[PDB]
């Protein structure tokens, strides 16, 4: 299962393994069979900037959603990875995306005390 190996490599921050798996047939837009999460979701949550950048370069959907309605921007804003938030926004991440409960990335930044990210997102929503 090349797709699942790519998800796990992104989750684990294994940059070389991510690049090798894709060159070897793994789909940059692979998704988990049960919850729909993509490699970019996992890299944004786990905080691996270089993997985020290579997935985007290779064609990852910046606005992919999982079964809870979470986008990569939701995940990075929740954990508090400012540089990843900025990269995602630069690549067209939807600042107004609502999860299954109506929550935006800004809402998750607020809930997790990530005020610098919250300010970035508030200003991008202007």
């Amino acid at each position: 299962d090349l797709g699942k190996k790519l998800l796990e490599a992104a989750r684990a921050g294994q940059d070389d393994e991510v690049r090798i798996l894709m060159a070897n047939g793994a789909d940059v837009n692979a998704s988990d069979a049960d919850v729909g999460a993509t490699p970019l979701h996992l890299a944004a949550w786990a905080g691996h900037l270089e993997i985020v950048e290579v997935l985007l370069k290779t064609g990852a959907d910046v606005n992919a959603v999982d079964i809870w309605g979470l986008t990569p921007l939701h995940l990075a804003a929740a954990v508090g990875h400012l540089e990843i938030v900025e990269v995602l926004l630069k690549h067209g991440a939807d600042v107004n995306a609502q999860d299954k409960f109506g929550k935006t990335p800004f809402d998750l930044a607020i809930d997790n005390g990530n005020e610098d990210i919250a300010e970035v997102l508030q200003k991008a929503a202007k």
């Binding site: 988990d32 949550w45 979470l70 939701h74 995940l75 929740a78 954990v79 409960f101 929550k103």
Partner: peptide, 15 residues
């Protein structure tokens, strides 16, 4: 486990 993310924590956590 400290990150307030909702039910999706089941898949992502981690912290």
């Amino acid at each position: 486990k400290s990150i307030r993310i909702g039910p999706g924590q089941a898949f992502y956590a981690x912290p």
